[PDB]
Design an enzyme around this catalytic site. Sequence first.
Site, PDB file in Angstrom:
ATOM      1  N   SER A  74      88.560  28.578  41.592  1.00 31.32           N
ATOM      2  CA  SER A  74      88.033  29.770  42.260  1.00 31.32           C
ATOM      3  C   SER A  74      87.212  29.420  43.502  1.00 31.32           C
ATOM      4  CB  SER A  74      87.204  30.596  41.280  1.00 31.32           C
ATOM      5  OG  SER A  74      88.040  31.166  40.274  1.00 31.32           O
ATOM      6  N   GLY A  83      88.236  26.839  37.579  1.00 29.63           N
ATOM      7  CA  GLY A  83      87.553  25.855  38.413  1.00 29.63           C
ATOM      8  C   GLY A  83      88.071  25.794  39.843  1.00 29.63           C
ATOM      9  N   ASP A 133      86.311  39.957  46.246  1.00 29.68           N
ATOM     10  CA  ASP A 133      85.837  38.689  45.726  1.00 29.68           C
ATOM     11  C   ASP A 133      85.690  37.691  46.865  1.00 29.68           C
ATOM     12  OD1 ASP A 133      84.912  36.974  43.827  1.00 29.68           O
ATOM     13  OD2 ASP A 133      86.888  36.565  42.934  1.00 29.68           O
ATOM     14  N   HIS A 159      82.500  36.089  42.592  1.00 29.00           N
ATOM     15  CA  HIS A 159      82.454  35.906  41.132  1.00 29.00           C
ATOM     16  C   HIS A 159      81.919  34.554  40.735  1.00 29.00           C
ATOM     17  CE1 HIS A 159      86.462  33.757  40.926  1.00 29.00           C
ATOM     18  NE2 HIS A 159      85.825  33.159  39.902  1.00 29.00           N
TER      19      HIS A 159
END
Length: 246
Positions: free
Chosen positions: A198, A196, A97, A46
């Site tokens: 991730s 932020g 993800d 993502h």
Amino acid sequence: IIGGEFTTIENQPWFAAIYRRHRGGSVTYVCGGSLISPCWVISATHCFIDYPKKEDYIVYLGRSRLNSNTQGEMKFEVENLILHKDYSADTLAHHNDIALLKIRSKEGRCAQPSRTIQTIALPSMYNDPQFGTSCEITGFGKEQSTDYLYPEQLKMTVVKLISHRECQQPHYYGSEVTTKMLCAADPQWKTDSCQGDSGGPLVCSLQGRMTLTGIVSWGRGCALKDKPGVYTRVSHFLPWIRSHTK
């Protein structure tokens, strides 16, 4: 990272800081990542899906600060940006993800281990700590949900692993969470990953070894009651990691 503590790169030497260059040439932070081998950084799809072009990105290792240089840091271009073909997004609950970035420097080299740059071990397949185990998370994400700025100094905190059975309750995340995801949160909900963070590491000590158990993926807000952080469950993706890193 909501709550938790400031840190430097020595305490998470596999942490990779991933930035993107704009048309115009401004460079802004995108996401965290983890160095799993000298040439490979693992992150979240993502982070990259909107802008899937490898020329767009810069990866730093051994960096403790967001917008200033850390002594001894290494800068890398992205030789290959590999996103998981079965990625999907929900309102927010992204499936699969996971992403891989093959890194190489302007001088055509991969990472050189040092005091500030090291790899993190992958888990063995389907081998995770039991629920309630304390693990750590690391990132340059927001310190408060309402914040506009990201912290200039790297942060880390501790969250406890939550069982799939607990996380799948309707007052938690219901069907948004799958067995290929891991939930983690603070017993007081006072600390958590946030925007932020991730792509960054969830690291657990598993049988005496520091292990990349999870990758920061999604959550409903940050540090909210009944709403844990959600992490890509690395031990469920080993064949994918192994095939794509060749």
